[PDB]
C-alpha cells in the first residue's frame, strides 16, 4: 500500500530517534580492570577496600565507588524499565522498517530493464 | 492506506472519531423522536 520514498523516511526517523534515545540511556561498564603491584608480599596483602579506601558495597559499584572518608520507588524504577523498552522497539520498528525496504527495493530492481537470465553479464550502454 | 503516526496525532484522530460517534448518536436520536411525532 505504500511507496519506497515514505518507508525510507520513516526508518530514518527511527534511526536518529534511536540514536538520541540510546544517548540518554545509561549503561553499566563491563571492562576488565587490573592493578600493577610492586612485590609478592604487597600482592598478597592487596584488598580492594584498602586500594580504593572504600567499603565492600562501594567496591561492587565500579561507576561511583566513593571513598570512605567522602562518605563520612517501584513506579520510578518501573519507569526506568520502560524507557529501555521504548528504545528496544525503536530498534524493533527500525529492523521491521528495514525489512520492508529491501523487498520494495527488490521488486523495483526486478522491474528494472535488464537481461535477467539471475542477471546475465552485460555491459550497459 | 497505511501510515505510522506520532503520539500527538493519534490523540487527535482518537478524539475526532469520538466526536463523530457522539455526533451521529445525537443526530441519530433526534430523527426517531420527530419520526415518532
Amino acid at each position: 500500500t505504500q511507496d519506497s520514498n515514505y518507508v525510507r523516511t520513516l526508518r530514518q526517523i527511527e534511526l536518529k530517534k534511536l540514536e538520541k534515545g540510546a544517548k540518554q540511556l545509561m549503561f553499566k561498564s563491563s571492562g576488565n580492570h587490573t592493578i600493577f603491584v610492586d612485590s609478592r608480599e604487597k600482592m598478597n596483602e592487596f584488598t580492594p577496600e584498602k586500594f580504593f579506601n572504600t567499603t565492600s558495597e562501594m567496591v561492587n559499584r565500579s561507576e561511583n565507588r566513593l571513598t570512605k572518608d567522602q562518605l563520612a520507588k517501584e513506579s520510578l524504577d518501573k519507569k526506568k524499565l520502560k524507557k529501555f523498552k521504548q528504545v528496544k522497539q525503536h530498534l524493533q520498528r527500525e529492523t521491521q522498517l528495514k525489512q520492508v525496504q529491501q523487498r520494495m527495493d527488490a521488486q523495483r530492481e526486478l522491474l528494472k530493464k535488464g537481461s535477467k537470465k539471475k542477471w546475465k553479464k552485460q555491459r550497459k550502454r | 492506506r497505511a501510515v505510522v503516526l506520532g503520539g500527538d496525532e493519534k490523540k487527535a484522530r482518537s478524539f475526532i472519531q469520538k466526536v463523530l460517534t457522539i455526533s451521529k448518536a445525537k443526530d441519530s436520536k433526534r430523527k426517531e423522536q420527530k419520526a415518532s411525532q
Binding site: 521504548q86 522497539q89 520498528r93 521491521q96 522498517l97 | 492506506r1 497505511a2 501510515v3 505510522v4 503516526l5 493519534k10 484522530r13 475526532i16 472519531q17
Partner: peptide, 11 residues
C-alpha cells in the same frame, strides 16, 4: 480520509 487510513507499528 482518516477512515481510509489504518495505523501500524502502534506505540
Amino acid at each position: 480520509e482518516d477512515e481510509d487510513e489504518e495505523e501500524v507499528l502502534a506505540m
